[PDB]
């Protein structure tokens, strides 16, 4: 069958088209010593030097990406690339030189029979059962607002923000450190990330939650580290994700995710705006926070025209909506004519990925 | 003159014909008489909405409740106030921030 590989800055999600979830999720890391990939690189981090091939959504080191792909096929999925068509994903605004190099490697280093490169945000939208709306995709390395009309991502209305999962982890590390604990290394990075996913949430009104959260005997929560050690965690639960709406928290002059959404909508024809406002779809691991849908509703309502219908959609599966949408798409009959093909490849070069 | 209309034979009903032939088709047709890109796109978007209308994926729910429960625990308790207690708390905190700011202004100098 067809393979579906979602190359994220933090996590690769791979599996088989038609399946309801990936079969392999693993860090997008390559380790050489002073070559290992994935979980096996996390373990041996003392000895190994770690690199990340994918930076802010975009592949920037190809050899390590070659080891990531190699790992994916053989170790994770236990297949030959020769025998399976391959769906791959790129970040919106992926430069063309990039999608072409992706295509070449697949055809000449992996000799895949067929291939395709689809836009992550577009796959999430299809996965929500829509072909028009605006997606907010936020992962580990990048956040994008992607306006989409009838299956077409409007390249000039696309908003990018280099503030995502990893920065939030790093910010929590810092504010938990300010409190008295000590989280400064990468072997402490992966610990705090787990706290973030276990206990952080998003405040509806920030000022209000600072002034009022301390009344709940539930605000402060204990968390057992691997030391057997118990630390407490309070208002840093909502101080952490608040950076998405107030990037200044980590010295970023950039505007917050609610404003980029609005800005993005405002770069589209006034006549399709009703459609975008009512189809805000969130995807990516960093949209998991409880309270995030509600806070976006309130924020968008505040920016949008007075009588405008606003509607935030947040599917329980949004950590995976990209991989899912890739598996829906690669299963479709009407889609089968769209695979780029071995034959096609050697009579147009990589340029047939335009 | 009206016979220029006669030269057009509306009675052929070739639009009728092509309409009936299109209705009977399946979302994807076999035999492979290559679709132009636009036909292919329009079919794709039709099939996408179709292969999606009834797909549930509710086996993805409550895969995150520790995070979700802890949040609710808090919002439960925090509703207990009133636009007063909290307006006066926001006003209190506000005044604190000033003192707090005036504080480290003297600190590091
Ligand atoms: N429940 C959760 N709450 C908050 N953050 C979460 C949660 N679950 C996962 N994350 C974060 O989401 C990120 C992973 O999301 P995802 O896999 O969508 O990104 P990616 O595809 O690897 O990176 P990108 O899309 O930015 O290139 C990590 O930062 C992870 O900590
Ligand atoms: Ca991603």
| Alpha carbons A240 and A172: distance in angstroms, whole number | 6
| Alpha carbons A186 and A54: distance in angstroms, whole number | 18
Contact B70 A217 (CB under 8 A): no
Contact B49 A216 (CB under 8 A): no
Chain A residues near any Cβ of chain B (below 8 Å): 20, 126, 129-131, 150-151, 197-201, 207-213, 215-219, 221, 237, 288-291, 315-317, 320, 324, 328-329, 331-335, 337-338
Q: Are residues A74 and A147 in the same domain?
A: no
The nearest CA of chain A is from the CA of B87 a distance in Å of 8
CATH number for the domain spanning A238: value is 3.90.640.10
Interface test with A, best of B59, B62, B67 (most A CBs within 10 A): B67
A81 lines ligand 1 (CB under 6 A): no
Q: Are residues A238 and A291 in the same domain?
A: no
Q: Are residues A26 and A175 in the same domain?
A: no
Q: Are residues A229 and A158 in the same domain?
A: no
Q: Are residues A141 and A287 in the same domain?
A: yes
CA dihedral over A55, A60, A63, A65, signed as positive or negative? positive
Q: In terms of residues, how long is chain B?
A: 109
**Number of domains composing chain A:** 3
Q: What residue ranges define each of the domains in chain B, with the CATH number in brackets?
A: 1-109 (6.10.250.1880)
Dihedrals phi, psi of A136, to nearest 5 degrees: -105, 105
State the burial class of residue A122 (Cβ atoms within 10 Å of its Cβ: 0-12, 13-18, 19+): buried
A92 lines ligand 1 (CB under 6 A): no
SS3 A113: coil
Q: Of A226, A254, A282, which residue is a domain's last?
A: A254
Determination approach:
X-ray
Q: CB within 8 A of A21, min separation 6: which ones?
A: A15, A320, A323, A324
| Alpha carbons B37 and A338: distance in angstroms, whole number | 9
B42: chain A residues, CB-CB within 8 Å = none
Interface test with B, best of A133, A218, A334 (most B CBs within 10 A): A334
Q: Are residues A137 and A182 in the same domain?
A: no
Q: Are residues A5 and A106 in the same domain?
A: yes
* Residues of the domain holding A97: 1-120+322-354
What are the tokens at A299? 């924020």
Q: Are residues A312 and A341 in the same domain?
A: no
B43 alpha carbon – ligand 1 mean position (Å): 33
Residue with CA at minimum distance from ligand 1 atom 2: A197
Q: Are residues A269 and A250 in the same domain?
A: no
Q: CB within 8 A of A120, min separation 6: which ones?
A: A6, A57, A89, A90, A91, A92, A137, A283, A322
Q: CB within 8 A of A213, min separation 6: which ones?
A: A203, A219, A234, A235, A238, B74, B78
Q: Are residues A116 and A128 in the same domain?
A: no
Q: In terms of residues, how long is chain A?
A: 354
Q: Are residues A57 and A92 in the same domain?
A: yes
| Alpha carbons A56 and A9: distance in angstroms, whole number | 6
- Count of A-B CB contacts under 8 Å: 112
Q: Pinpoint the alpha helices (H) of A105-204.
A: 120-127, 165-178, 186-199
Q: CB within 8 A of A106, min separation 6: which ones?
A: A81, A86, A88, A112, A115
DSSP A73: I
CATH number for the domain spanning A9: value is 3.30.420.40
Q: Which of A136, A105, A107, A133 is nearest to A120 (CA)?
A: A136
Q: Are residues A246 and A295 in the same domain?
A: no
């Amino acid at each position: 069958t067809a393979l579906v590989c979602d190359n994220g800055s933090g996590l690769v999600k791979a599996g088989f088209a038609g399946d309801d979830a990936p079969r392999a999720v693993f860090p997008s890391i390559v380790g050489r010593p002073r070559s290992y990939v994935g979980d096996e690189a996390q373990s041996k981090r003392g000895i190994l030097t770690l690199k990340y091939p994918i930076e802010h959504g975009i592949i920037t080191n190809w050899d390590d990406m070659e080891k990531i792909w190699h790992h994916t096929f053989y170790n994770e999925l236990r297949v030959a690339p020769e025998e399976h068509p391959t769906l791959l994903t790129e970040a919106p605004l992926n430069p063309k030189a990039n999608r072409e190099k992706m295509t070449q490697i697949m055809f000449e280093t992996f000799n895949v029979p067929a291939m395709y490169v689809a836009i992550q945000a577009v796959l999430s939208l299809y996965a929500s059962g829509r072909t028009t709306g605006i997606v907010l995709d936020s992962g580990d390395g990048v956040t994008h607002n992607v306006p989409i009309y009838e299956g077409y991502a409007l390249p000039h209305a696309i908003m990018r923000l280099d503030l995502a999962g990893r920065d939030l982890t790093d910010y929590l590390m810092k504010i938990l450190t300010e409190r008295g604990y000590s989280f400064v290394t990468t072997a402490e990075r992966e610990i705090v990330r787990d706290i973030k996913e276990k206990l952080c949430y998003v405040a509806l009104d920030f000022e209000n939650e600072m002034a009022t959260a301390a009344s709940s005997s539930s605000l402060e929560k204990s968390y057992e580290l691997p030391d057997g050690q118990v630390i407490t965690i309070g208002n840093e639960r909502f101080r952490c994700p608040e950076t998405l709406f107030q990037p200044s928290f980590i010295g970023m002059e950039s505007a917050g995710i609610h404003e980029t959404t609005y800005n993005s909508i405002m770069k589209c024809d006034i006549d399709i705006r009703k459609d975008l406002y009512a189809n805000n779809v969130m995807s990516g691991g960093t949209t998991m926070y409880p309270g995030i849908a509600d806070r976006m509703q309130k924020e968008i309502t505040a920016l949008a025209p007075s009588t405008m219908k606003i509607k935030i959609i947040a599917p329980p599966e949004r950590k995976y909506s990209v991989w899912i949408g890739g598996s829906i798409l690669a299963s479709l009959s009407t889609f089968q004519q769209m695979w780029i093909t071995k034959q096609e490849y050697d009579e147009a070069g990589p340029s047939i990925v335009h | 003159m009206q016979q220029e209309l006669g030269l057009l034979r509306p009675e052929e009903r070739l639009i009728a014909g092509q309409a009936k032939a299109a209705a009977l088709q399946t979302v994807h047709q076999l035999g492979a008489v290559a679709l132009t890109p636009e036909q292919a796109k329009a079919a794709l978007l039709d099939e996408i909405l179709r292969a999606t209308q009834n797909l549930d994926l509710r086996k993805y729910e409550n895969l995150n409740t520790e995070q979700q429960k802890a949040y609710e625990q808090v919002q439960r308790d925090l509703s207990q106030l009133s636009p007063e207690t909290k307006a006066l708390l926001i006003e209190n905190q506000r005044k604190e921030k000033t003192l707090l700011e005036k504080a480290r202004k003297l600190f590091q100098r």
